[PDB]
Amino acid sequence: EDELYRQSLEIISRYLREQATGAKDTKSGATSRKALETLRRVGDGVQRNHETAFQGMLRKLDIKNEDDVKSLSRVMIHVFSDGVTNWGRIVTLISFGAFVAKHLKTINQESCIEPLAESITDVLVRTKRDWLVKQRGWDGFVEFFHV
């Protein structure tokens, strides 16, 4: 019933899971494909450049289980509390999400990766839908970061 939510979740969940597992997944394909490739290029870069800061942030969050996920949900909402939305903030959140997914994999909480992806998708689709639609969704995401 909500195609933008479904597509966004598909892109974000796939990226978070393949970052965690190290293998891509086998199971709107055109736009989603390009977005994922874009996310790999750009998102990996963010994690590399800001690995130290990401580590510090993770420790302060103290994520041990599914209920800890709400604490990231509150943090992510706070990011946009200044009324500003752009692709830079969105990719940064998705990148930190991938970083957290890696952490969940290392602490044997792999089942927490999906709820993680859903909470990130909740913040972006549920609270920033109008902006996302204005950017032509993930097609605009791909165009914004085209090189």
């Binding site: 450049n49 800061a53 706070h78 990011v79 509390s81 830079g88 940064t92 959140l93």
Partner: peptide
Amino acid sequence: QIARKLQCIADQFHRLHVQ
């Protein structure tokens, strides 16, 4: 704060990638 740091990082990301 974590949210403020993520904001800062997002800002660095843009300034590094603007062309």
